[PDB]
Amino acid sequence: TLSILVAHDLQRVIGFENQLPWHLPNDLKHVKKLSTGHTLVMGRKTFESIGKPLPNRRNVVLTSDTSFNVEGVDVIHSIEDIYQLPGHVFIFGGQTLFEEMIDKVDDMYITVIEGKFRGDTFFPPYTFEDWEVASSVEGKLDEKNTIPHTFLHLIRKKLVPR
């Protein structure tokens, strides 16, 4: 199974200066819950932003850099390598990987950040005409999580006659 995992705001901003534009601990917990025991595939810039592999999942980094070798990280050099990965694979970011993969994935786990942030990187446009809402869950707000957000699980719709 191949999924996208992403947080984007009302204008599909996902990043600014190689960081998340928002501080939202619950979304990172959401991410942890979904991906534990599975595989993350991420672009090189996304990896460098995080700075270390996330524990208790397979960390796969896509890069053209043949010198890339980081302890606890598997490296691939082509999109086509993604399909050889076993198990449940999450496309983890960033913009380049989402653009390359949005037409290929089975489904998407999207956190809609219900705000408008300054960004320099974006999730590609998509339409709910093509995507069934398997679930939509409002994130709970508290002292440490102050931005309204919604967890979407979207599944690609089949093209059928009439």
Ligand SMILES: NC(=O)c1ccc[n+]([C@@H]2O[C@H](COP(=O)([O-])OP(=O)(O)OC[C@H]3O[C@@H](n4cnc5c(N)ncnc54)[C@H](OP(=O)(O)O)[C@@H]3O)[C@@H](O)[C@H]2O)c1
């Ligand atoms: N909000 C979210 O859910 C979320 C999630 C993840 C990331 N982000 C944000 O996204 C932004 C980064 O996105 P980005 O597009 O600038 O960078 P990125 O996708 O994280 O990484 C880009 C790099 O990935 C490698 N790559 C991508 N496609 C490749 C291919 N077909 N073959 C070989 N290598 C390939 C290249 O590495 P080399 O240049 O080393 O070859 C490329 O320069 C940051 O702002 C980050 O904070 C947001």
Ligand SMILES: CCC(CC)[C@H]1c2ccccc2CNN1C(=O)/C=C/c1cc(Cc2cnc(N)nc2N)cc(OC)c1OC
């Ligand atoms: C530190 C708290 C948490 C969970 C307690 C911590 C963690 C700790 C232990 C075990 C697992 C995990 C999983 N997570 N962490 C991270 O430290 C990584 C976050 C992260 C993640 C992304 C990609 C991303 C974010 N959000 C959504 N919805 N989709 C995505 N693909 C980008 C980023 O910076 C561009 C990130 O660094 C901010």
